[PDB]
Short mmCIF file of N, CA and C and ligand atoms in Angstrom, two decimals:
data_model
loop_
_atom_site.label_atom_id
_atom_site.label_comp_id
_atom_site.label_asym_id
_atom_site.label_seq_id
_atom_site.Cartn_x
_atom_site.Cartn_y
_atom_site.Cartn_z
N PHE M 1 53.39 39.00 82.80
CA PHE M 1 53.88 40.00 83.82
C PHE M 1 53.21 39.74 85.14
N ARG M 2 53.92 39.06 86.05
CA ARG M 2 53.28 38.79 87.38
C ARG M 2 54.36 38.10 88.25
N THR M 3 53.88 37.46 89.34
CA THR M 3 54.87 36.79 90.21
C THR M 3 55.78 35.90 89.44
N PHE M 4 56.94 35.58 89.97
CA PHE M 4 57.90 34.70 89.24
C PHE M 4 57.70 33.23 89.60
N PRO M 5 57.08 32.50 88.75
CA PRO M 5 56.83 31.02 89.00
C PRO M 5 58.15 30.31 88.87
N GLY M 6 58.76 30.12 90.04
CA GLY M 6 60.06 29.34 90.03
C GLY M 6 61.16 30.17 90.74
N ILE M 7 60.82 31.37 91.19
CA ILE M 7 61.87 32.18 91.86
C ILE M 7 61.26 32.90 93.05
N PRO M 8 61.26 32.24 94.18
CA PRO M 8 60.68 32.79 95.40
C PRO M 8 61.60 33.96 95.90
N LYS M 9 60.97 35.10 96.27
CA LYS M 9 61.80 36.20 96.73
C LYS M 9 62.59 35.79 97.99
N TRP M 10 61.96 35.69 99.14
CA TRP M 10 62.67 35.29 100.38
C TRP M 10 62.47 33.78 100.64
N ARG M 11 63.45 33.09 101.14
CA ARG M 11 63.35 31.65 101.43
C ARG M 11 63.31 31.45 102.98
N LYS M 12 64.12 32.18 103.66
CA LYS M 12 64.20 31.99 105.16
C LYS M 12 62.77 31.93 105.71
N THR M 13 62.66 31.61 106.98
CA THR M 13 61.30 31.53 107.59
C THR M 13 61.12 32.69 108.52
N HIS M 14 62.12 33.54 108.72
CA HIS M 14 61.94 34.67 109.63
C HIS M 14 62.50 35.93 109.06
N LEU M 15 61.69 36.76 108.46
CA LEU M 15 62.19 38.04 107.86
C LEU M 15 62.01 39.18 108.88
N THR M 16 62.55 40.32 108.54
CA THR M 16 62.49 41.49 109.53
C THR M 16 62.42 42.74 108.70
N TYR M 17 61.87 43.77 109.21
CA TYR M 17 61.81 45.03 108.43
C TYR M 17 62.22 46.23 109.20
N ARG M 18 62.45 47.36 108.62
CA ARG M 18 62.86 48.58 109.40
C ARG M 18 61.91 49.71 109.06
N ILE M 19 61.27 50.34 110.01
CA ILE M 19 60.31 51.40 109.73
C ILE M 19 61.11 52.76 109.56
N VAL M 20 61.60 53.02 108.41
CA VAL M 20 62.34 54.30 108.20
C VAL M 20 61.45 55.31 107.48
N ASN M 21 60.17 55.01 107.31
CA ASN M 21 59.26 55.95 106.68
C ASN M 21 58.51 56.77 107.69
N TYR M 22 57.99 57.89 107.32
CA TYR M 22 57.26 58.74 108.35
C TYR M 22 56.74 59.98 107.63
N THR M 23 55.85 60.71 108.26
CA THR M 23 55.32 61.99 107.69
C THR M 23 54.39 62.65 108.67
N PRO M 24 54.15 63.95 108.46
CA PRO M 24 53.26 64.67 109.35
C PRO M 24 51.88 64.11 109.14
N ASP M 25 51.62 63.58 107.97
CA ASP M 25 50.33 62.93 107.65
C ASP M 25 50.26 61.60 108.42
N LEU M 26 51.38 61.19 108.96
CA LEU M 26 51.39 59.91 109.77
C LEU M 26 52.53 59.93 110.75
N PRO M 27 52.16 59.96 111.98
CA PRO M 27 53.15 59.94 113.05
C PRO M 27 53.88 58.58 113.07
N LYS M 28 54.81 58.47 113.99
CA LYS M 28 55.58 57.16 114.06
C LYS M 28 54.64 56.01 113.80
N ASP M 29 53.73 55.79 114.66
CA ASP M 29 52.77 54.62 114.55
C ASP M 29 51.98 54.58 113.23
N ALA M 30 51.79 55.78 112.66
CA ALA M 30 50.98 55.77 111.38
C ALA M 30 51.84 55.29 110.25
N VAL M 31 52.92 55.93 109.95
CA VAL M 31 53.80 55.40 108.86
C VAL M 31 54.20 53.97 109.30
N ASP M 32 54.53 53.80 110.54
CA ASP M 32 54.87 52.48 111.05
C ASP M 32 53.61 51.58 110.81
N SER M 33 52.52 52.22 110.81
CA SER M 33 51.27 51.44 110.57
C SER M 33 51.33 50.79 109.20
N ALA M 34 51.44 51.55 108.16
CA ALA M 34 51.55 50.97 106.76
C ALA M 34 52.67 49.92 106.76
N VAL M 35 53.66 50.15 107.53
CA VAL M 35 54.77 49.14 107.59
C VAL M 35 54.26 47.93 108.35
N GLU M 36 53.28 48.13 109.17
CA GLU M 36 52.66 47.00 109.98
C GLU M 36 51.51 46.40 109.16
N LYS M 37 50.80 47.24 108.41
CA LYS M 37 49.68 46.67 107.62
C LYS M 37 50.29 46.05 106.44
N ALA M 38 51.29 46.61 105.85
CA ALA M 38 52.02 46.02 104.69
C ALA M 38 52.69 44.71 105.13
N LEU M 39 53.57 44.92 106.10
CA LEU M 39 54.27 43.71 106.63
C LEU M 39 53.28 42.63 107.00
N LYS M 40 52.23 43.02 107.68
CA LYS M 40 51.29 42.02 108.11
C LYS M 40 50.45 41.50 106.92
N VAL M 41 50.21 42.35 106.02
CA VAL M 41 49.47 41.93 104.83
C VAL M 41 50.11 40.74 104.25
N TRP M 42 51.37 40.75 104.10
CA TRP M 42 52.14 39.56 103.53
C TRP M 42 52.52 38.57 104.63
N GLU M 43 52.63 39.04 105.85
CA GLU M 43 53.05 38.12 106.93
C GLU M 43 51.83 37.20 107.23
N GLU M 44 50.68 37.69 106.98
CA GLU M 44 49.46 36.91 107.21
C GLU M 44 49.14 36.08 105.96
N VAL M 45 49.22 36.70 104.80
CA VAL M 45 48.93 35.89 103.58
C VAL M 45 49.86 34.68 103.55
N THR M 46 51.04 34.78 104.17
CA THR M 46 51.94 33.59 104.14
C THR M 46 52.12 33.16 105.61
N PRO M 47 52.70 31.98 105.80
CA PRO M 47 52.96 31.43 107.16
C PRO M 47 54.30 32.00 107.64
N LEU M 48 55.06 32.64 106.79
CA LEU M 48 56.40 33.24 107.22
C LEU M 48 56.20 34.11 108.44
N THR M 49 57.28 34.35 109.16
CA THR M 49 57.24 35.18 110.32
C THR M 49 57.93 36.52 110.08
N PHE M 50 57.86 37.45 110.95
CA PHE M 50 58.55 38.77 110.65
C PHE M 50 58.91 39.47 111.97
N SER M 51 60.01 40.19 112.01
CA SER M 51 60.40 40.91 113.18
C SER M 51 60.65 42.38 112.81
N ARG M 52 61.15 43.17 113.66
CA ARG M 52 61.34 44.63 113.30
C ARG M 52 62.53 45.21 114.02
N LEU M 53 63.01 46.34 113.55
CA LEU M 53 64.17 47.04 114.15
C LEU M 53 64.26 48.47 113.69
N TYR M 54 65.36 49.06 113.89
CA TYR M 54 65.55 50.54 113.42
C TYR M 54 67.05 50.81 113.36
N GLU M 55 67.81 49.78 113.08
CA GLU M 55 69.30 49.97 112.95
C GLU M 55 69.88 49.00 111.92
N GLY M 56 71.17 49.06 111.70
CA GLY M 56 71.79 48.18 110.71
C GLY M 56 70.86 48.08 109.46
N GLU M 57 70.07 47.03 109.41
CA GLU M 57 69.14 46.91 108.23
C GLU M 57 68.32 45.55 108.31
N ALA M 58 67.03 45.67 108.39
CA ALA M 58 66.19 44.45 108.47
C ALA M 58 66.15 43.79 107.09
N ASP M 59 65.07 43.11 106.86
CA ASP M 59 64.94 42.45 105.56
C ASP M 59 64.26 43.37 104.55
N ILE M 60 63.32 44.13 105.04
CA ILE M 60 62.59 45.09 104.14
C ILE M 60 62.79 46.51 104.78
N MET M 61 63.87 47.19 104.48
CA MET M 61 64.08 48.54 105.04
C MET M 61 63.02 49.48 104.48
N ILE M 62 61.97 49.70 105.23
CA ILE M 62 60.92 50.66 104.72
C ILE M 62 61.32 52.08 105.00
N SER M 63 61.66 52.84 103.99
CA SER M 63 62.11 54.25 104.31
C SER M 63 61.44 55.25 103.45
N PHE M 64 61.33 56.46 103.93
CA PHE M 64 60.66 57.51 103.08
C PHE M 64 61.74 58.25 102.26
N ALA M 65 61.40 58.60 101.01
CA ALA M 65 62.44 59.33 100.12
C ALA M 65 61.76 59.87 98.86
N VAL M 66 62.53 60.54 98.07
CA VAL M 66 61.96 61.10 96.79
C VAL M 66 63.06 61.13 95.71
N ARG M 67 62.83 61.88 94.66
CA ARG M 67 63.87 61.95 93.57
C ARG M 67 65.20 62.40 94.14
N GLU M 68 65.95 61.48 94.70
CA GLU M 68 67.28 61.90 95.28
C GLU M 68 67.97 60.57 95.86
N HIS M 69 67.76 59.47 95.24
CA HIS M 69 68.36 58.23 95.76
C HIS M 69 69.88 58.23 95.41
N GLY M 70 70.20 58.66 94.23
CA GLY M 70 71.64 58.69 93.82
C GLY M 70 71.69 58.57 92.27
N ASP M 71 71.36 57.49 91.70
CA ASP M 71 71.44 57.31 90.27
C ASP M 71 70.52 56.19 89.81
N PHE M 72 69.51 55.89 90.61
CA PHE M 72 68.57 54.77 90.24
C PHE M 72 67.21 55.03 90.84
N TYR M 73 66.34 54.02 90.84
CA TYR M 73 64.97 54.18 91.39
C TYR M 73 64.68 55.56 91.99
N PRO M 74 64.54 56.52 91.05
CA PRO M 74 64.32 57.92 91.40
C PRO M 74 62.83 58.07 91.72
N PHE M 75 62.50 58.57 92.85
CA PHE M 75 61.03 58.79 93.16
C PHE M 75 60.50 60.08 92.46
N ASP M 76 59.40 60.47 92.78
CA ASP M 76 58.82 61.72 92.23
C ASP M 76 57.41 62.00 92.70
N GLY M 77 57.25 62.22 94.02
CA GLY M 77 55.90 62.44 94.62
C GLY M 77 54.97 63.01 93.56
N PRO M 78 55.33 64.10 92.93
CA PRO M 78 54.45 64.64 91.86
C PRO M 78 54.53 63.76 90.66
N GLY M 79 54.20 62.53 90.80
CA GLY M 79 54.26 61.53 89.66
C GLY M 79 53.61 60.22 90.04
N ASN M 80 53.17 59.46 89.08
CA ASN M 80 52.49 58.18 89.44
C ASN M 80 53.47 57.35 90.33
N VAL M 81 54.75 57.42 90.17
CA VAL M 81 55.66 56.65 91.03
C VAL M 81 55.34 56.87 92.47
N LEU M 82 54.41 56.21 93.02
CA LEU M 82 54.03 56.35 94.46
C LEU M 82 55.10 55.76 95.42
N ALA M 83 55.51 54.56 95.18
CA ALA M 83 56.51 53.93 96.08
C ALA M 83 57.14 52.61 95.52
N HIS M 84 57.99 51.99 96.23
CA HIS M 84 58.61 50.75 95.71
C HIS M 84 59.62 50.10 96.66
N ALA M 85 60.02 48.88 96.39
CA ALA M 85 60.99 48.25 97.27
C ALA M 85 62.13 47.60 96.41
N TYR M 86 62.96 46.79 97.00
CA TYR M 86 64.05 46.16 96.16
C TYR M 86 63.83 44.67 96.02
N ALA M 87 64.81 43.91 95.58
CA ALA M 87 64.65 42.45 95.40
C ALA M 87 65.67 41.72 96.27
N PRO M 88 65.80 40.45 96.01
CA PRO M 88 66.78 39.66 96.84
C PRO M 88 68.22 39.93 96.34
N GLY M 89 69.01 40.58 97.12
CA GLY M 89 70.43 40.84 96.73
C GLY M 89 71.25 41.05 97.93
N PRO M 90 72.16 42.01 97.88
CA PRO M 90 73.10 42.33 99.04
C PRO M 90 72.24 42.99 100.16
N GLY M 91 72.26 44.32 100.15
CA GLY M 91 71.51 45.02 101.22
C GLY M 91 70.11 45.29 100.73
N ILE M 92 69.96 45.42 99.46
CA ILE M 92 68.60 45.71 98.91
C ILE M 92 67.77 44.39 98.97
N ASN M 93 68.26 43.40 99.67
CA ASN M 93 67.51 42.12 99.80
C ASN M 93 66.23 42.43 100.56
N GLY M 94 65.39 43.26 100.01
CA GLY M 94 64.11 43.61 100.69
C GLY M 94 64.27 45.03 101.27
N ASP M 95 63.65 45.97 100.62
CA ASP M 95 63.74 47.37 101.14
C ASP M 95 62.64 48.16 100.43
N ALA M 96 61.71 48.68 101.21
CA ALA M 96 60.63 49.47 100.53
C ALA M 96 60.80 50.93 100.86
N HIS M 97 60.11 51.79 100.11
CA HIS M 97 60.26 53.26 100.46
C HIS M 97 59.01 53.97 99.97
N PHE M 98 58.52 54.90 100.76
CA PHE M 98 57.28 55.64 100.39
C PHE M 98 57.65 57.04 99.82
N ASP M 99 57.05 57.44 98.78
CA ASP M 99 57.38 58.79 98.21
C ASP M 99 57.39 59.78 99.38
N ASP M 100 58.17 60.84 99.25
CA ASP M 100 58.12 61.86 100.33
C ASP M 100 57.87 63.22 99.76
N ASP M 101 57.22 63.26 98.61
CA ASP M 101 56.97 64.56 98.01
C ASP M 101 55.43 64.83 98.07
N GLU M 102 54.65 63.80 98.32
CA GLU M 102 53.15 64.03 98.41
C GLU M 102 52.76 63.77 99.87
N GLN M 103 52.24 62.62 100.17
CA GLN M 103 51.82 62.29 101.59
C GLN M 103 51.24 60.94 101.68
N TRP M 104 51.08 60.32 102.76
CA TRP M 104 50.53 58.95 102.89
C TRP M 104 49.54 58.94 104.09
N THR M 105 48.39 58.41 103.89
CA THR M 105 47.39 58.34 104.91
C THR M 105 46.82 56.95 105.00
N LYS M 106 46.40 56.50 106.12
CA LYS M 106 45.76 55.13 106.19
C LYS M 106 44.39 55.25 105.60
N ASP M 107 43.76 56.33 105.89
CA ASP M 107 42.42 56.52 105.33
C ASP M 107 42.57 57.05 103.92
N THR M 108 41.62 57.83 103.46
CA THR M 108 41.81 58.39 102.11
C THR M 108 42.03 59.82 102.20
N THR M 109 42.95 60.24 103.13
CA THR M 109 43.18 61.71 103.33
C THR M 109 44.42 62.16 102.59
N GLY M 110 45.45 61.30 102.42
CA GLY M 110 46.66 61.76 101.67
C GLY M 110 46.84 60.91 100.45
N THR M 111 47.48 59.84 100.56
CA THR M 111 47.73 58.91 99.45
C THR M 111 47.09 57.56 99.77
N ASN M 112 47.88 56.64 100.24
CA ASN M 112 47.35 55.28 100.58
C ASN M 112 48.36 54.62 101.48
N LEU M 113 48.60 55.19 102.68
CA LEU M 113 49.61 54.61 103.65
C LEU M 113 49.79 53.10 103.45
N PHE M 114 49.19 52.28 104.21
CA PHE M 114 49.34 50.82 104.10
C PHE M 114 49.06 50.32 102.69
N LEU M 115 48.33 51.05 101.91
CA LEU M 115 48.11 50.55 100.52
C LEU M 115 49.48 50.37 99.85
N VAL M 116 50.21 51.49 99.69
CA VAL M 116 51.48 51.42 99.06
C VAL M 116 52.43 50.77 100.05
N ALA M 117 51.98 50.53 101.27
CA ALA M 117 52.96 49.88 102.24
C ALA M 117 52.97 48.38 101.86
N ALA M 118 51.84 47.76 101.84
CA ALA M 118 51.81 46.37 101.45
C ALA M 118 52.23 46.35 100.01
N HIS M 119 52.17 47.50 99.32
CA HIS M 119 52.58 47.46 97.93
C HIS M 119 54.11 47.23 97.92
N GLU M 120 54.87 47.96 98.69
CA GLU M 120 56.35 47.76 98.73
C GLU M 120 56.73 46.60 99.59
N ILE M 121 56.16 46.44 100.74
CA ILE M 121 56.48 45.24 101.59
C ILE M 121 56.09 44.04 100.83
N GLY M 122 55.05 44.20 100.04
CA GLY M 122 54.51 43.08 99.23
C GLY M 122 55.42 42.96 98.05
N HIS M 123 56.06 44.02 97.63
CA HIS M 123 56.95 43.99 96.45
C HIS M 123 58.17 43.11 96.73
N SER M 124 58.81 43.27 97.85
CA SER M 124 59.99 42.49 98.16
C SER M 124 59.67 41.14 98.83
N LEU M 125 58.92 41.17 99.89
CA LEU M 125 58.61 39.87 100.62
C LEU M 125 57.15 39.45 100.34
N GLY M 126 56.61 39.89 99.20
CA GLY M 126 55.24 39.55 98.88
C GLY M 126 55.11 38.91 97.49
N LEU M 127 55.15 39.69 96.47
CA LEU M 127 55.06 39.17 95.11
C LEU M 127 55.40 40.22 94.05
N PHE M 128 55.01 39.97 92.81
CA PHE M 128 55.31 41.01 91.74
C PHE M 128 54.00 41.84 91.49
N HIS M 129 53.00 41.22 90.85
CA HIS M 129 51.76 41.99 90.57
C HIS M 129 50.63 41.01 90.30
N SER M 130 49.79 40.80 91.22
CA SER M 130 48.67 39.82 91.01
C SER M 130 47.38 40.66 90.53
N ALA M 131 46.33 39.97 90.35
CA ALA M 131 45.09 40.70 89.89
C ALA M 131 44.76 41.69 91.03
N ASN M 132 45.31 42.82 90.99
CA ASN M 132 45.04 43.79 92.07
C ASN M 132 43.86 44.69 91.73
N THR M 133 43.11 44.37 90.70
CA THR M 133 41.90 45.17 90.43
C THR M 133 41.14 45.20 91.77
N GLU M 134 41.36 44.19 92.53
CA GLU M 134 40.82 44.05 93.89
C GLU M 134 41.98 44.00 94.89
N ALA M 135 43.04 43.38 94.50
CA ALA M 135 44.24 43.26 95.45
C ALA M 135 44.83 44.66 95.78
N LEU M 136 45.98 44.62 96.42
CA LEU M 136 46.71 45.87 96.90
C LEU M 136 47.66 46.41 95.82
N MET M 137 48.07 45.65 94.83
CA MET M 137 49.04 46.18 93.89
C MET M 137 48.42 47.16 92.88
N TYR M 138 47.13 47.29 92.85
CA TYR M 138 46.47 48.24 91.82
C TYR M 138 45.31 49.05 92.46
N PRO M 139 45.17 49.13 93.75
CA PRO M 139 44.08 49.98 94.36
C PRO M 139 44.48 51.40 94.32
N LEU M 140 45.75 51.66 94.55
CA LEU M 140 46.32 53.05 94.55
C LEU M 140 45.46 53.99 93.79
N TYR M 141 45.22 53.75 92.55
CA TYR M 141 44.38 54.66 91.77
C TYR M 141 42.92 54.57 92.25
N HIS M 142 42.69 54.84 93.54
CA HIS M 142 41.30 54.71 94.08
C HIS M 142 41.34 55.00 95.61
N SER M 143 40.89 54.11 96.43
CA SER M 143 40.93 54.35 97.93
C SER M 143 40.78 53.06 98.65
N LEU M 144 41.71 52.70 99.51
CA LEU M 144 41.58 51.40 100.22
C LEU M 144 42.85 51.24 101.13
N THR M 145 43.27 52.28 101.81
CA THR M 145 44.45 52.12 102.63
C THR M 145 43.98 51.96 104.09
N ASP M 146 42.72 52.17 104.36
CA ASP M 146 42.16 52.07 105.74
C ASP M 146 40.69 52.39 105.75
N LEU M 147 40.22 53.19 104.80
CA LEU M 147 38.77 53.54 104.77
C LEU M 147 37.85 52.52 105.44
N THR M 148 37.31 51.62 104.62
CA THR M 148 36.45 50.59 105.25
C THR M 148 36.74 49.22 104.65
N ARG M 149 37.54 49.16 103.66
CA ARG M 149 37.88 47.84 103.00
C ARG M 149 39.38 47.57 103.15
N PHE M 150 40.18 48.57 103.08
CA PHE M 150 41.65 48.48 103.18
C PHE M 150 42.11 47.05 103.47
N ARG M 151 42.64 46.43 102.46
CA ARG M 151 43.18 45.02 102.62
C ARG M 151 43.67 44.44 101.30
N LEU M 152 44.23 43.31 101.26
CA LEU M 152 44.74 42.73 99.95
C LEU M 152 43.65 41.87 99.29
N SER M 153 43.88 41.49 98.09
CA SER M 153 42.83 40.63 97.39
C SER M 153 43.29 39.19 97.40
N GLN M 154 42.62 38.34 96.69
CA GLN M 154 43.02 36.88 96.65
C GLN M 154 44.05 36.74 95.52
N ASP M 155 44.32 37.68 94.68
CA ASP M 155 45.33 37.53 93.68
C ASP M 155 46.68 37.92 94.28
N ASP M 156 46.76 39.03 94.97
CA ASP M 156 48.06 39.32 95.62
C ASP M 156 48.28 38.24 96.68
N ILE M 157 47.23 37.89 97.37
CA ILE M 157 47.40 36.79 98.34
C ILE M 157 47.93 35.55 97.67
N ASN M 158 47.55 35.42 96.41
CA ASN M 158 48.03 34.24 95.63
C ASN M 158 49.53 34.46 95.35
N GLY M 159 49.92 35.55 94.82
CA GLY M 159 51.32 35.84 94.59
C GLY M 159 52.18 35.61 95.82
N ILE M 160 51.85 36.28 96.89
CA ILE M 160 52.65 36.13 98.10
C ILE M 160 52.53 34.69 98.64
N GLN M 161 51.35 34.13 98.57
CA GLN M 161 51.17 32.76 99.03
C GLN M 161 52.15 31.90 98.17
N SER M 162 52.42 32.33 96.95
CA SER M 162 53.36 31.57 96.13
C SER M 162 54.79 31.92 96.61
N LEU M 163 54.92 33.04 97.29
CA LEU M 163 56.24 33.43 97.86
C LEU M 163 56.59 32.36 98.93
N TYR M 164 55.76 32.36 99.95
CA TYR M 164 56.05 31.36 101.07
C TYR M 164 55.12 30.15 100.86
N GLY M 165 54.20 29.90 101.81
CA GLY M 165 53.30 28.76 101.64
C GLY M 165 53.43 27.78 102.85
N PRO M 166 52.66 26.79 102.84
CA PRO M 166 52.68 25.75 103.92
C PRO M 166 53.93 24.87 103.74
N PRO M 167 54.49 24.42 104.90
CA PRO M 167 55.64 23.59 104.90
C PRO M 167 55.33 22.18 104.41
N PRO M 168 56.23 21.62 103.71
CA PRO M 168 56.04 20.24 103.15
C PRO M 168 56.15 19.24 104.28
N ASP M 169 57.30 19.20 104.94
CA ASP M 169 57.50 18.20 106.05
C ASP M 169 58.66 18.69 106.91
N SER M 170 59.86 18.67 106.39
CA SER M 170 61.05 19.13 107.17
C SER M 170 60.71 20.35 107.98
N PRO M 171 60.51 20.22 109.26
CA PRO M 171 60.14 21.35 110.15
C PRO M 171 61.39 22.19 110.38
N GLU M 172 62.53 21.68 110.22
CA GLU M 172 63.78 22.46 110.41
C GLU M 172 64.85 22.05 109.40
N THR M 173 65.95 22.71 109.34
CA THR M 173 67.07 22.41 108.37
C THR M 173 67.37 20.89 108.60
C1 LIG P 201 48.71 49.98 96.05
O1 LIG P 201 49.03 49.67 94.68
C2 LIG P 201 49.92 50.53 94.12
C3 LIG P 201 50.98 51.03 94.84
C4 LIG P 201 51.94 51.89 94.27
C5 LIG P 201 51.74 52.34 92.93
S1 LIG P 201 52.87 53.46 92.22
O2 LIG P 201 53.69 53.93 93.22
O3 LIG P 201 52.16 54.39 91.40
N1 LIG P 201 53.85 52.65 91.16
C6 LIG P 201 53.13 51.81 90.15
C7 LIG P 201 53.09 52.55 88.88
C8 LIG P 201 53.39 53.90 88.79
C9 LIG P 201 53.38 54.54 87.58
C10 LIG P 201 53.00 53.79 86.44
N2 LIG P 201 52.70 52.49 86.48
C11 LIG P 201 52.76 51.88 87.67
C12 LIG P 201 55.04 52.05 91.79
C13 LIG P 201 54.80 50.59 92.22
O4 LIG P 201 53.79 49.97 91.87
N3 LIG P 201 55.66 50.02 92.98
O5 LIG P 201 55.49 48.71 93.41
C14 LIG P 201 56.09 52.07 90.69
C15 LIG P 201 56.69 53.43 90.56
C16 LIG P 201 57.25 51.06 91.02
C17 LIG P 201 50.64 51.85 92.19
C18 LIG P 201 49.72 50.93 92.75
CA1 CA P 202 55.23 60.21 93.12
CA1 CA P 203 67.07 44.15 102.50
ZN1 ZN P 204 62.84 54.66 96.40
ZN1 ZN P 205 54.18 47.32 92.21
#
């Protein structure tokens, strides 16, 4: 149970995301922060590039929501299901979303803003689940969204690094 050895999530070299998440516990820049710490968490672990927007749909639509998606990935603030994103497909080709029934903070005041941010941005354009005992995919049950360590480990860095990585030679198509 971990990254898919032989199936890279995104292949392009320029991904983009949409900051559709937000909360009183995090103003635009704060929720956008987790979208920036998450996005950057994997944008830095890999050489891939990333852009942003707020219309149509980027590569990782980061949006806030709860038990009310329609008939699938049902959230539940009042439940371990803190957040999640989608996989490579049609529009769900990268889309994260933060629970909207509890709260998200960069520090340890609400939940784990960028923690679950790189968790979902890491989910679609990052990896599956690396040794997050230190990484970002398993800190949630603790504190590390901004306090004084807030960052990914070498195992999630490994999974995402397995996502993108250094170029072999062909600099362009
Ligand atoms: C920062 O690392 C983590 C982020 C989010 C979660 S989660 O939201 O609790 N959850 C994992 C999980 C919940 C309940 C039982 N077992 C695992 C999300 C998740 O990890 N999404 O990528 C589930 C609901 C998809 C935990 C750690
Ligand atoms: Ca929940
Ligand atoms: Ca997408
Ligand atoms: Zn959702
Ligand atoms: Zn996960």
